[PDB]
Amino acid sequence: RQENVDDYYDTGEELGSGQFAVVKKCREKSTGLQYAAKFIKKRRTKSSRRGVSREDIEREVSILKEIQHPNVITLHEVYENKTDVILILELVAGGELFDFLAEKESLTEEEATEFLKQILNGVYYLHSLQIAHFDLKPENIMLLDRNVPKPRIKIIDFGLAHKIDFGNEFKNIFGTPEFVAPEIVNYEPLGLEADMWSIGVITYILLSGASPFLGDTKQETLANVSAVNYEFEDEYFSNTSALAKDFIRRLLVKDPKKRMTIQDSLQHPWIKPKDTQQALSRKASAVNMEKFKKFAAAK
C-alpha cells in the first residue's frame, strides 16, 4: 500500500466529518483531476476507543475495490501511514439528493422515479454481487453534479457494508433507528432485505416530507419500526398515487422473506408502468413539496 498522499495530492477544503473520519476535496498532481480524500483514523491499540479497527477498515476497502457502477461511489486510490488509512474516492460534488429536490417548485412522481430508479439500479448492482450497504438513508444519496439537465445519483458511505457470507449469520447494532429494518431493531439475522426496507423509508419521505416511524424518543422509534406502525395520512399523501403507496407498502414488510426484492422493485408498475393509464397516474401525481421542503430544512 502506498504511503505519502501529500506527494501526490494537493488537499483542499473540508467536505464533511463523521465518527473517526474527515473528508476533504483534493486534486491529483499528475492528472490535475479532482477527488475526495476520506481520512480514517486507525485504532492505535486494542484498548483505545478512538479510531476504526483494521478489520473494519479493510472490509470497507475490499468492498470499494469491487464496485464499478455509475450509481455507486468509486475508489481511486488507497494510502496508509502510521495514523490513518486514506481513501481517495470519486468526488461527488452535487450535494444530497434531498437538498437538490427541495429547491424545485414541484416534483411529479414521474420526476421522482427518475431519481429513485438510479438508487434502485445502484442497489441492484450491489445485491447482485451479494453486498448489503446497510446504511441507506437520505444523507448517503448524493448527486455527482447538480448543474446538468439529468443529475446522476451516487450512493456513498460503505462504512457499514458487508459481503453476505452464506455460512454464518450476521447480526449487529448499527445505523440510524428511523431508517433501519425490524431485523436490525430486534437483533435478528441480517441480509440484503434490510436495504429494501430502507429504500421504502427513503421513498415514503421523498413523497411526503414525513418520517414514517420516527417517534419522540429513540425507544418509541424502535417500537414503531418493530411493530411496522405507520400510515399514509391524507394531509401528507393527498396527491400520491395508489401505485406509489403499493410500492412503499411492499417494502415496509416485517418478515424479510416476504419483503419485495431489488429485482422485483425494478419491475413494480410504479417504476415500470405496464400500460398508459398507470403511466399517466405517475405523471399527474406529485410530492407534497411544502412539507418536503420543511423536512429538508429541519435536518
UniProtKB/Swiss-Prot annotation:
The gene is DAPK1. Induction: Up-regulated following treatment with IFNG/IFN-gamma. The autoinhibitory domain sterically blocks the substrate peptide-binding site by making both hydrophobic and electrostatic contacts with the kinase core. This is Death-associated protein kinase 1. Isoform 2 is expressed in normal intestinal tissue as well as in colorectal carcinomas. The active site is at D135. ATP binds at residues 15-23, 38, 90-92, 96, 157. It comes from the Eukaryota. Residues 9-271 form the Protein kinase domain. Calcium/calmodulin-dependent serine/threonine kinase involved in multiple cellular signaling pathways that trigger cell survival, apoptosis, and autophagy. Regulates both type I apoptotic and type II autophagic cell deaths signal, depending on the cellular setting. The former is caspase-dependent, while the latter is caspase-independent and is characterized by the accumulation of autophagic vesicles. Phosphorylates PIN1 resulting in inhibition of its catalytic activity, nuclear localization, and cellular function. Phosphorylates TPM1, enhancing stress fiber formation in endothelial cells. Isoform 2 cannot induce apoptosis but can induce membrane blebbing. Ubiquitinated by the BCR(KLHL20) E3 ubiquitin ligase complex, leading to its degradation by the proteasome. Removal of the C-terminal tail of isoform 2 (corresponding to amino acids 296-337 of isoform 2) by proteolytic cleavage stimulates maximally its membrane-blebbing function. Disulfide bonds: none annotated. Residues 288-297 are annotated as: Autoinhibitory domain.
